[PDB]
Amino acid sequence: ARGSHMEEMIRSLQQRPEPTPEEWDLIHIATEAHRSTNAQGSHWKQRRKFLPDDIGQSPIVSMPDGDKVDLEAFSEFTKIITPAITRVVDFAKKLPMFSELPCEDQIILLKGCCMEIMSLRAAVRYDPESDTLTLSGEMAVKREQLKNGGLGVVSDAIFELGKSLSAFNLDDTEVALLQAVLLMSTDRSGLLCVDKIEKSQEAYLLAFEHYVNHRKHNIPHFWPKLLMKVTDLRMIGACHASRFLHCKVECPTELFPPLFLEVFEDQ
């Protein structure tokens, strides 16, 4: 019927496929890679400081879509963006299927997912009571502030994602696997090792579907619902890439930290 008598008893309430031992090892590695690079781990809610409320209310630099930029808010956010980008690279480097790619492939994949991953890490720290996001576990920001400091409607999409993810009760492994599925994408141009990257994505997706089955979440249809959030995050990444091109047409390079320009000054 099954396996041994013990195995069937332990699996008695399981229906759905659980992770294999090899998937559990993949899951453990990705979870630890995320927790060792996710800032302020559990400490974030006490240790975050609100962005002063008089910053972000003065958008005066024009943009093509008519959502203007407040340069002082954009400066406060870019001031802390280089350590946050650096943690996404630290995370990817800790995944063996990423670190074994050619160096050129690893840079293309990191450029392709960086905003998706930093937006997910802000959105999972949405706080319903203050209606804020937390940036790098330290800066609490209101919708108006993040919208006027350069993101424009991107910030609304991240807040909407953050508010919707509260009911999903994601744990650190789910966040780490959504990050690995975002990272291991072949939807980018100029990759060499396409088949290998697709195979990794498929291994991460299936470990992730089996870990979701293991967790027995209390909202129904959890796995497709979570896939639809991955799609929302890729839309957020595309919106940000379009918006960042416009930033650079409008504003001088001196305002953009070198690593921020490198990861996104892109297509």
Q: Is 183 in the site for ligand T3 (CB under 6 A)?
A: no
Residue choice 23, 48, 77, 132 for contact with ligand T3 (CB under 6 A): 77
Residue choice 31, 136, 185, 201 for contact with ligand T3 (CB under 6 A): 136
Q: Is 233 in the site for ligand T3 (CB under 6 A)?
A: no
State which residue, 125 or 210, has the beta carbon closest to ligand T3: 125
- DSSP for 36-86, please give it: TTSTTTTTHHHH-EEPPTTSSS---B--TTS--B-HHHHHHHHTTHHHHHH
50-64: b (≥16 Cβ within 10 Å) or e: ebeeebbeebeeebe
Residue choice 149, 152, 162, 237 for contact with ligand T3 (CB under 6 A): 149
Angle at CA of residue 192, ends 201 and 186, nearest 5°: 35
Q: Is 251 in the site for ligand T3 (CB under 6 A)?
A: no
Element (H or E) spanning 134, and its range?
A: strand 133-135
State which residue, 135 or 181, has the beta carbon closest to ligand T3: 135
Q: Shortest Cβ distance from residue 229 to ligand T3 (Å)?
A: 15
Question: Of 84, 258, 115, 261, whose CA–CA distance to 185 is shortest?
Answer: 115
For residue 134, the one-letter residue type is T
Residue choice 81, 170, 197, 212 for contact with ligand T3 (CB under 6 A): 81
Q: Is 80 in the site for ligand T3 (CB under 6 A)?
A: yes
- Residues in the chain, total: 267
Q: Is 122 in the site for ligand T3 (CB under 6 A)?
A: yes
Q: Is 84 in the site for ligand T3 (CB under 6 A)?
A: yes
Phi, psi of 18, rounded to the nearest 5 degrees = -95, 170
Closest residue (Cβ) to ligand T3?
Answer: 150
Q: Is 74 in the site for ligand T3 (CB under 6 A)?
A: yes
State which residue, 26 or 39, has the beta carbon closest to ligand T3: 39
Instruction: Name 134's bridge partners.
Output: 140
Q: Shortest Cβ distance from residue 74 to ligand T3 (Å)?
A: 5
State which residue, 59 or 137, has the beta carbon closest to ligand T3: 137
Question: Of 25, 22, 21, 23, whose CA–CA distance to 7 is shortest?
Answer: 21
Contacts with ligand T3 by CB under 6 A lie at 39, 74, 77, 80-81, 84, 87, 115, 118-119, 121-122, 135-137, 149-151, 158, 244
